[PDB]
JSON list of C-alpha atoms in Angstrom, two decimals:
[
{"chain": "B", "resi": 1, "resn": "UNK", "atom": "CA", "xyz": [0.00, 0.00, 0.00]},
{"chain": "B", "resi": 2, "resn": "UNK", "atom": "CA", "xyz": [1.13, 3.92, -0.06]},
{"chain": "B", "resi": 3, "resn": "UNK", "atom": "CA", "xyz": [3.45, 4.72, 3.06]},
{"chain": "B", "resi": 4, "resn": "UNK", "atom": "CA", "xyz": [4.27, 8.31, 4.67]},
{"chain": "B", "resi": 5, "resn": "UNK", "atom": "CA", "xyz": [7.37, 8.99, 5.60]},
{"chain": "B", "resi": 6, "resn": "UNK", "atom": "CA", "xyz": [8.08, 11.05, 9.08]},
{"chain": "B", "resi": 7, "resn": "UNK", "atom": "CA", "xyz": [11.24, 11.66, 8.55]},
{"chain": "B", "resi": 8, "resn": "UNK", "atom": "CA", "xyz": [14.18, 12.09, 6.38]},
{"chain": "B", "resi": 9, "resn": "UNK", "atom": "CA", "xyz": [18.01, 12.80, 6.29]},
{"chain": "B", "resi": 10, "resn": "UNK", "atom": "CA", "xyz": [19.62, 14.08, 3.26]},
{"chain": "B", "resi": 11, "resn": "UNK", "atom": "CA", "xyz": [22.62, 12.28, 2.30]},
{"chain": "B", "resi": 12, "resn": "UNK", "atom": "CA", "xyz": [25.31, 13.87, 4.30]},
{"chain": "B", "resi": 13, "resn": "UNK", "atom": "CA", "xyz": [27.09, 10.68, 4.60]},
{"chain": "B", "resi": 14, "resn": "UNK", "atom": "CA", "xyz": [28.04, 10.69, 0.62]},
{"chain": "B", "resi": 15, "resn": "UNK", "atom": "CA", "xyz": [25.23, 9.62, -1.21]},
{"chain": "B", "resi": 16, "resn": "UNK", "atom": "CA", "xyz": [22.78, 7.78, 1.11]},
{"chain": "B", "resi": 17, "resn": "UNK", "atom": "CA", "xyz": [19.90, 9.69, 2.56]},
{"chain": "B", "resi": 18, "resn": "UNK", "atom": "CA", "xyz": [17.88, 7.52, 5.24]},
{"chain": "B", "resi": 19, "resn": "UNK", "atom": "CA", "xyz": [13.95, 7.61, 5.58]},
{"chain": "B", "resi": 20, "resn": "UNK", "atom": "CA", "xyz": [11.45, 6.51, 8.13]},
{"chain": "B", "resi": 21, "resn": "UNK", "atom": "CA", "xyz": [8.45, 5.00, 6.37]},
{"chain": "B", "resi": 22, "resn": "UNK", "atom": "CA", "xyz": [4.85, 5.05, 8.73]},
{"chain": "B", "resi": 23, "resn": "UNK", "atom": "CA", "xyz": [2.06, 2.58, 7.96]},
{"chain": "B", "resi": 24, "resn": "UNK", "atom": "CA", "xyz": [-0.92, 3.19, 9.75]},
{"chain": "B", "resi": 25, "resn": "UNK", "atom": "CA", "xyz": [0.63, 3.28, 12.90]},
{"chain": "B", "resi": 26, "resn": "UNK", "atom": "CA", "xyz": [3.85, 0.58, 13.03]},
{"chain": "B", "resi": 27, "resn": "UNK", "atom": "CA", "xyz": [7.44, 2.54, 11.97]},
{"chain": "B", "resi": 28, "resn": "UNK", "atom": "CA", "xyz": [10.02, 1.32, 9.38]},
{"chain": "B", "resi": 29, "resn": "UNK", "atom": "CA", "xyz": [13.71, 2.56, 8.54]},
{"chain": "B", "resi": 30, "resn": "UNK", "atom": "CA", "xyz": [15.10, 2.15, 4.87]},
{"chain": "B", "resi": 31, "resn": "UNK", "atom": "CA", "xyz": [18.64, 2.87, 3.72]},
{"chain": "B", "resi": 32, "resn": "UNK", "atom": "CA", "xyz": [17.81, 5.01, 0.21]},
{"chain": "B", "resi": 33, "resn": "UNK", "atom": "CA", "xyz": [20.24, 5.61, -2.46]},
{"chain": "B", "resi": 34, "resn": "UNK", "atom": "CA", "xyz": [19.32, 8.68, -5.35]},
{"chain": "B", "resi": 35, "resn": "UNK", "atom": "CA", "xyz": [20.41, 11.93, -6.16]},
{"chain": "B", "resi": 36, "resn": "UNK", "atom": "CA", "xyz": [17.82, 14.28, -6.16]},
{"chain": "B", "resi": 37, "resn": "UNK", "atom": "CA", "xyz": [17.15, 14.30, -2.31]},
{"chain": "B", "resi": 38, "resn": "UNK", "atom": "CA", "xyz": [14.18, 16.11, -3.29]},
{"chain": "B", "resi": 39, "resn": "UNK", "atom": "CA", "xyz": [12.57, 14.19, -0.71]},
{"chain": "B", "resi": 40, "resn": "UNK", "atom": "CA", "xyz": [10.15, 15.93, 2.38]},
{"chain": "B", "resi": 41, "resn": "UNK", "atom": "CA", "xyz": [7.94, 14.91, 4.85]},
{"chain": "B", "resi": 42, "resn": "UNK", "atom": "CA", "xyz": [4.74, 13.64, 4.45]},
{"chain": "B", "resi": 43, "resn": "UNK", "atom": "CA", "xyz": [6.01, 11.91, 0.66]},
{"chain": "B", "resi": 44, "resn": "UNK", "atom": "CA", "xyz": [3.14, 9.45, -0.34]},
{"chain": "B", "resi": 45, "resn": "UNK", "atom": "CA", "xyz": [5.60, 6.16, -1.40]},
{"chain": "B", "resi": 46, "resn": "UNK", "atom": "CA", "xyz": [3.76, 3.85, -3.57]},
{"chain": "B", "resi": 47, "resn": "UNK", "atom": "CA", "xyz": [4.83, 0.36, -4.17]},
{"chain": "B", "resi": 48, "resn": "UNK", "atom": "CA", "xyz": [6.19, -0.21, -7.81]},
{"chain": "B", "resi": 49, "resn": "UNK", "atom": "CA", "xyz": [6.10, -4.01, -7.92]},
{"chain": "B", "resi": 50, "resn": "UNK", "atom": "CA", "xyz": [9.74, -5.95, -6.64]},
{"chain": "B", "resi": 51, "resn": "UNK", "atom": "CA", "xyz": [10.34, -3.67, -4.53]},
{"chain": "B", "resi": 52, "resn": "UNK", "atom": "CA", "xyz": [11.43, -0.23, -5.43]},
{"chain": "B", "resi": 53, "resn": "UNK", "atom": "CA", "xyz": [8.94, 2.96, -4.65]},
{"chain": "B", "resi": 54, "resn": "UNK", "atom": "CA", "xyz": [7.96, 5.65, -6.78]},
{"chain": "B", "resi": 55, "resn": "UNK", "atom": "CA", "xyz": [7.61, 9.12, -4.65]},
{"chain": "B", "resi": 56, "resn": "UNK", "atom": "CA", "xyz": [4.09, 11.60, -5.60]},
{"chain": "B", "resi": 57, "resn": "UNK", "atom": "CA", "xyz": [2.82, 9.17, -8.19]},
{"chain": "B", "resi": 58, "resn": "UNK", "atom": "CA", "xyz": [5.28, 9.84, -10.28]},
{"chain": "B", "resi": 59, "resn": "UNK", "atom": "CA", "xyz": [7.81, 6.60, -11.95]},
{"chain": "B", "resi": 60, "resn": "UNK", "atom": "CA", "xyz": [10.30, 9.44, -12.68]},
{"chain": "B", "resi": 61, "resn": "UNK", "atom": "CA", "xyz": [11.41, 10.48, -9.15]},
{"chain": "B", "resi": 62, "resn": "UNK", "atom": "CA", "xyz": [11.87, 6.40, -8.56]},
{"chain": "B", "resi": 63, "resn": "UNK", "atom": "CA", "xyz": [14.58, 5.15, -5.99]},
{"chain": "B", "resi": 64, "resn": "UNK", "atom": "CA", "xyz": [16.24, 1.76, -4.33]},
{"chain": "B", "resi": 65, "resn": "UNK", "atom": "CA", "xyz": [15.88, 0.79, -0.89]},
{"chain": "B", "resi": 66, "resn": "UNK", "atom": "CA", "xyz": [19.53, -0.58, 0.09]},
{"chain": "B", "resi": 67, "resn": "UNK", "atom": "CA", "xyz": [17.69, -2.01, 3.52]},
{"chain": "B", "resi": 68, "resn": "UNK", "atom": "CA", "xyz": [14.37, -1.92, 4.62]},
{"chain": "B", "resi": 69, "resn": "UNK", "atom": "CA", "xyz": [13.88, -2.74, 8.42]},
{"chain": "B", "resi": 70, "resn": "UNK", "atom": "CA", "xyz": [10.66, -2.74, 10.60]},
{"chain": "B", "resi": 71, "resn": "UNK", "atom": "CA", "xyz": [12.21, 0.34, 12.81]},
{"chain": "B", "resi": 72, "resn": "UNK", "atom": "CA", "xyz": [14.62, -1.79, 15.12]},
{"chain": "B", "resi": 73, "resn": "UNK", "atom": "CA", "xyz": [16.21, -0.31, 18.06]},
{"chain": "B", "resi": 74, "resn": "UNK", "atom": "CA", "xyz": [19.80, -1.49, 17.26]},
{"chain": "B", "resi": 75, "resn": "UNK", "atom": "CA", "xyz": [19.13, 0.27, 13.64]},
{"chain": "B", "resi": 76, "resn": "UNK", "atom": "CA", "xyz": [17.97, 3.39, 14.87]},
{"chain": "B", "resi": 77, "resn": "UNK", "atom": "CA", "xyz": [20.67, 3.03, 17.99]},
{"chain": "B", "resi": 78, "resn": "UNK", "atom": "CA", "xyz": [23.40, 2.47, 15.60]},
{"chain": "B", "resi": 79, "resn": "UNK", "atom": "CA", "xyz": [21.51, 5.00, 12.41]},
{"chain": "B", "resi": 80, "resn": "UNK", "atom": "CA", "xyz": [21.10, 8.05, 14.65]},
{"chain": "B", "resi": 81, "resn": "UNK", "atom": "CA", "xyz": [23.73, 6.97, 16.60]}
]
């Protein structure tokens, strides 16, 4: 189904900007690897079909999730570490 994501860092590691996707009420954290860190809160992510996610409807601002995870506390221990 669509997500929302809460929040969002840009990629000020080098070229990997990290994203917390909501569903309903449950939390998720995905590495993300693009370009255009156009990204902002409240992005509708819609599922494309393996796996990737197309941002505001739209298959040109597409992107790859390096590492989905159901919002862990080592992952966002060791993320926003």
């Amino acid at each position: 189904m669509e997500w929302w994501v809460k929040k969002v860092q840009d990629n000020a590691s080098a070229s990997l900007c990290r994203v917390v996707l909501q569903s309903g009420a449950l939390e998720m954290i995905a590495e993300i690897e693009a370009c255009r860190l156009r990204l902002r809160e409240g992005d509708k992510l819609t599922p494309l079909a393996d796996a990737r996610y197309c941002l505001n409807n739209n298959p040109t601002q597409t992107l790859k999730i390096r590492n989905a995870t159901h919002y862990s506390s080592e992952r966002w221990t060791n993320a926003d570490k």
